[PDB]
Design a protein around this motif. Sequence first.
Motif, mmCIF file in Angstrom:
data_model
loop_
_atom_site.group_PDB
_atom_site.id
_atom_site.type_symbol
_atom_site.label_atom_id
_atom_site.label_comp_id
_atom_site.label_asym_id
_atom_site.label_seq_id
_atom_site.Cartn_x
_atom_site.Cartn_y
_atom_site.Cartn_z
ATOM 1 N N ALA A 47 8.420 16.388 14.613
ATOM 2 C CA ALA A 47 8.440 16.067 13.194
ATOM 3 C C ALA A 47 8.418 14.554 12.985
ATOM 4 C CB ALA A 47 9.651 16.667 12.541
ATOM 5 N N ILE A 48 9.249 13.826 13.722
ATOM 6 C CA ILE A 48 9.405 12.403 13.486
ATOM 7 C C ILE A 48 8.140 11.677 13.941
ATOM 8 C CG2 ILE A 48 10.803 10.361 14.062
ATOM 9 C CD1 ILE A 48 13.236 12.000 14.090
ATOM 10 N N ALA A 49 7.633 11.973 15.139
ATOM 11 C CA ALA A 49 6.400 11.346 15.595
ATOM 12 C C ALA A 49 5.239 11.751 14.684
ATOM 13 C CB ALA A 49 6.113 11.695 17.030
ATOM 14 N N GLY A 50 5.184 13.036 14.336
ATOM 15 C CA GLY A 50 4.201 13.525 13.387
ATOM 16 C C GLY A 50 4.186 12.720 12.092
ATOM 17 N N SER A 51 5.364 12.330 11.610
ATOM 18 C CA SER A 51 5.438 11.637 10.338
ATOM 19 C C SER A 51 4.926 10.203 10.522
ATOM 20 C CB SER A 51 6.848 11.731 9.783
ATOM 21 O OG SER A 51 7.733 10.814 10.431
ATOM 22 N N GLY A 52 5.318 9.582 11.626
ATOM 23 C CA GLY A 52 4.781 8.291 12.008
ATOM 24 C C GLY A 52 3.256 8.272 12.112
ATOM 25 N N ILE A 53 2.643 9.336 12.629
ATOM 26 C CA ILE A 53 1.201 9.292 12.785
ATOM 27 C C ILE A 53 0.579 9.239 11.399
ATOM 28 C CG2 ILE A 53 -0.828 10.668 13.456
ATOM 29 C CD1 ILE A 53 0.968 11.436 15.974
ATOM 30 N N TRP A 54 1.021 10.137 10.512
ATOM 31 C CA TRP A 54 0.516 10.174 9.154
ATOM 32 C C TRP A 54 0.709 8.815 8.473
ATOM 33 C CZ3 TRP A 54 2.264 9.395 4.276
ATOM 34 C CH2 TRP A 54 1.363 9.720 3.264
ATOM 35 N N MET A 55 1.860 8.187 8.677
ATOM 36 C CA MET A 55 2.115 6.925 8.014
ATOM 37 C C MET A 55 1.046 5.908 8.428
ATOM 38 S SD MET A 55 6.317 6.653 8.154
ATOM 39 C CE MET A 55 7.106 8.266 8.092
ATOM 40 N N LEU A 56 0.758 5.770 9.732
ATOM 41 C CA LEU A 56 -0.248 4.822 10.205
ATOM 42 C C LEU A 56 -1.650 5.219 9.745
ATOM 43 C CD1 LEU A 56 1.056 3.876 13.749
ATOM 44 C CD2 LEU A 56 1.615 2.928 11.521
ATOM 45 N N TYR A 57 -2.018 6.484 9.908
ATOM 46 C CA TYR A 57 -3.267 6.957 9.342
ATOM 47 C C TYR A 57 -3.409 6.513 7.885
ATOM 48 C CZ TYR A 57 -6.154 10.400 6.876
ATOM 49 O OH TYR A 57 -7.021 11.013 6.001
ATOM 50 N N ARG A 58 -2.386 6.714 7.059
ATOM 51 C CA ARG A 58 -2.544 6.543 5.623
ATOM 52 C C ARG A 58 -2.720 5.062 5.270
ATOM 53 N NH1 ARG A 58 -3.570 5.163 1.425
ATOM 54 N NH2 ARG A 58 -3.425 6.293 -0.557
ATOM 55 N N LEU A 59 -2.089 4.204 6.070
ATOM 56 C CA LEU A 59 -2.068 2.770 5.846
ATOM 57 C C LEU A 59 -3.479 2.210 5.994
ATOM 58 C CD1 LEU A 59 -0.471 0.317 5.387
ATOM 59 C CD2 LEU A 59 0.412 0.441 7.716
ATOM 60 N N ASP A 60 -4.185 2.719 6.992
ATOM 61 C CA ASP A 60 -5.541 2.307 7.240
ATOM 62 C C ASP A 60 -6.522 2.815 6.186
ATOM 63 O OD1 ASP A 60 -4.778 0.819 9.646
ATOM 64 O OD2 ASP A 60 -4.592 2.784 10.623
ATOM 65 N N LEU A 61 -6.109 3.640 5.221
ATOM 66 C CA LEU A 61 -7.075 4.138 4.251
ATOM 67 C C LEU A 61 -7.352 3.137 3.129
ATOM 68 C CD1 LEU A 61 -6.466 7.907 3.579
ATOM 69 C CD2 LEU A 61 -8.171 6.803 4.983
ATOM 70 N N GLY A 62 -6.495 2.126 2.958
ATOM 71 C CA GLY A 62 -6.635 1.170 1.866
ATOM 72 C C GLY A 62 -5.379 1.099 0.999
ATOM 73 N N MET A 63 -5.484 0.349 -0.101
ATOM 74 C CA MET A 63 -4.357 -0.058 -0.922
ATOM 75 C C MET A 63 -4.189 0.890 -2.109
ATOM 76 S SD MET A 63 -4.885 -4.179 -1.074
ATOM 77 C CE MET A 63 -6.274 -3.809 -2.141
ATOM 78 N N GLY A 64 -2.975 1.441 -2.267
ATOM 79 C CA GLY A 64 -2.664 2.297 -3.395
ATOM 80 C C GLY A 64 -3.260 3.690 -3.245
ATOM 81 N N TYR A 65 -3.183 4.461 -4.311
ATOM 82 C CA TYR A 65 -3.658 5.825 -4.287
ATOM 83 C C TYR A 65 -5.179 5.791 -4.330
ATOM 84 C CZ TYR A 65 1.253 7.050 -5.088
ATOM 85 O OH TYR A 65 2.609 7.224 -4.935
#
Lengths: 259, 259, 259
Positions: free
Chosen positions: B34-52
């Motif tokens: 769960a914790i590593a899984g959440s970290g992966i999503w966090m890094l993935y999402r960061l690389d998508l750009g700024m804001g929603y």
Amino acid sequence: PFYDSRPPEGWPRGSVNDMDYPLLGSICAISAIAIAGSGIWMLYRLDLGMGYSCKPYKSGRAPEVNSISGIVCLLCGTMYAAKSFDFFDGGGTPFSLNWYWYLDYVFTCPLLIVDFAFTLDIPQKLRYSIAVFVALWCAVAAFATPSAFRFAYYALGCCWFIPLSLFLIRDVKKRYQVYPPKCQRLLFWACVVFFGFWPLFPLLFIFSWQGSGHISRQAYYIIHAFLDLVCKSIFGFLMTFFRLELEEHTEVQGLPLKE
Amino acid sequence: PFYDSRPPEGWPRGSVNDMDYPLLGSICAISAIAIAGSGIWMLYRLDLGMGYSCKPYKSGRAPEVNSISGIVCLLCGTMYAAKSFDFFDGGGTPFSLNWYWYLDYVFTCPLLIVDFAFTLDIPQKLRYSIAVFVALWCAVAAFATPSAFRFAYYALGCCWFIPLSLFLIRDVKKRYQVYPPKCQRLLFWACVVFFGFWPLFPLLFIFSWQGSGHISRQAYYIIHAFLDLVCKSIFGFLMTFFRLELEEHTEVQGLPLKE
Amino acid sequence: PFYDSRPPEGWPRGSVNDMDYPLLGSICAISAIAIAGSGIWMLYRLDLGMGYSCKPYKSGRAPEVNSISGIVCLLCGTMYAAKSFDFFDGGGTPFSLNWYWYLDYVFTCPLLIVDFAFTLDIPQKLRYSIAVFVALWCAVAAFATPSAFRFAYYALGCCWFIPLSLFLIRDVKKRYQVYPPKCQRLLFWACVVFFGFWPLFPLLFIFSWQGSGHISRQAYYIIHAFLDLVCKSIFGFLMTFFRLELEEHTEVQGLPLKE
Ligand SMILES: *C/C=C(C)/C=C/C=C(C)/C=C/C1=C(C)CCCC1(C)C
Ligand SMILES: *C/C=C(C)/C=C/C=C(C)/C=C/C1=C(C)CCCC1(C)C
Ligand SMILES: *C/C=C(C)/C=C/C=C(C)/C=C/C1=C(C)CCCC1(C)C
Ligand SMILES: CCCCCCCCCCCCCCCC(=O)O
Ligand SMILES: CCCCCCCCCCCCCCCC(=O)O
Ligand SMILES: CCCCCCCCCCCCCCCC(=O)O
């Protein structure tokens, strides 16, 4: 070691610590001198100025990050001196950098990838450096663990190491077209070291005493001396000349990257 | 451990290390994912750009500090994998992240407060991060010390922890009025985690085997799995969404903070 | 210690650990208060503004690096509290900051030289800080090693320490003419601490139990309390007042350095 010690009678014959200690100390001493020697030259050369033309820095100071290559060699060389001291004292000395495999790499390998990242302007330096760090801790655990869980630590290590190698290839492919040809040639060889020699470490594990048992501890110490010469010292020379060629192009000749 | 080891016969019945090892390994394995899984999503999402709206970074790169949330989760998840390996091997394995309480937190907790500080533009990041670091070392000492001096290390730990919590409240009060309402709402909940869950750790000590003796080691391992899910993973989601809401406001809509 | 422990009967009479533990704990407790006390004042004073006139920072925040002096004192003071706890418990307690000579200095001494470097605008801060770090590890090894190889670790330590002291003298000579006279006077005294008191540590080794055997462990603990007061706390006051005098000159009076 934290717990173990060499008996005063010496290690028992045929035990795992019955190695050729004068041979190993000799090899470590020579490795100490070459690697530290290379680090000294790297720092000396950096202070001479930018490129082959040795154009003065505008700051009068070279950039801090450029010192990383040379520093890592000074560090690795110093650790080889300690390792020789341990071996010439007969192994298992209290302060042994020989006893816990890969423990000494936990400091130097993250510095290597940071150096590579700054030299090439690879993004997300924090992500790469911590990735290497964690991977190396997995190696420490894999060598420290006698049970079948050593394979669990290996796989945990590969969950960091393989992702980060594939990301770095991707990144390097992006940068490679930016740079002039003489830089391209040195970057090729830096890649042969990273993508060619770094995988050898996990490959060797499979034949180690923690795997098929085909390679002894003595052999492993010798093999790592050589791998350390390539991955620290040669690698360091490549980063240094890469920068000299870049600076000759951009700073001394004032030409633009193909960015 | 550095010294101790599980007997080959196993731990003696009723000893302090006679716990339910398959239960603990199971809980650690699930926590790892769960914790590593959440970290992966966090890094993935960061690389998508700024804001929603996922507006491209001008650099083409997300800022290094934004990776801290995700990295801490990857780190904590990896440590839970190791912890499971130790528990499934029956405890007391040489490379045990279970053996020295709070030792594993010495790396991750300073990263948490740094992340919070950068996210909120709290001043004096060096002071906060070292404060947490020292506090955690006091906890390590408090669990490691069998005598009445464990209370001395507790009090020494509180000399850092309480001052730094009160300073941080003060700082957070200053920033809170700067931000738009959706950010205010996520910052409230980040505060419930910090000022609400961080004090629980020293509170639990008082009922631990180092205090009143009401809570066992097995229970303590389970309770920390849950606290680690809140203080690393949920906390990480809050920092991430806080930034997305900030960037939506300032970057994608180009509105100013009430600074 | 990792391995050793105090017998329940107590240390044997005349053994190397038969010291005056209440005396040492008393001295450590007093040192804890003075050094931490000095650190608190340093941080308090920094937040008051620039120079004696206490002119507001434009950022509303003091610069992060200026906190290093005060932080190092807080750190060293905290470590002296731990050291007192160990001594009042009778020595050899599991979490002993007394047991491994110089181990505690591995964190604080690199911070000292960084502080000095930033305060004076000495170049190549990375090179100086790692140099001190490695040197201190050599000292740890020298005290940890019972054989004649302790002299090998001493010499290895001197290969870092002497080069770095000579480079720093050179650098300091370059900066000294830049600064106004009241700064020159405080920089002189900072130099007496660095170039005058830092060499005493390796000098003391020669008369220690690892050398001629003229100085006991008890005496060594007392001597280091005093050296820590000079090299952390007094040194910290000098950096602080140096900056106040600089800022009074450049910021509050708007005069230029003789750069
Ligand atoms: C200078 C030395 C270097 C670059 C050493 C690198 C070491 C590795 C890439 C090690 C990797 C692993 C193992 C040896 C076993 C555990 C799994 C790995 C992949 C983390
Ligand atoms: C992710 C885990 C976190 C945030 C853990 C935090 C731990 C503490 C706040 C611990 C504090 C202390 C003790 C448990 C006992 C010693 C005294 C304290 C306050 C330093
Ligand atoms: C706050 C404490 C300080 C500044 C301590 C400094 C310690 C040294 C300069 C130690 C040096 C060495 C030894 C004591 C023995 C081994 C050789 C040296 C020169 C590295
Ligand atoms: C159960 C534990 C799972 C372990 C998680 C493995 C995560 C490691 C992979 C991340 C490394 C990537 C490094 C840089 C990536 C980038 O910069 O794009
Ligand atoms: C005898 C030892 C005493 C211990 C000293 C305790 C000092 C810790 C308190 C400082 C933490 C404050 C953190 C940030 C403060 C700020 O940024 O304003
Ligand atoms: C066999 C091992 C040899 C050890 C190598 C010693 C190298 C240390 C000397 C470098 C310290 C210099 C620090 C700053 C120099 C500068 O900034 O100019």
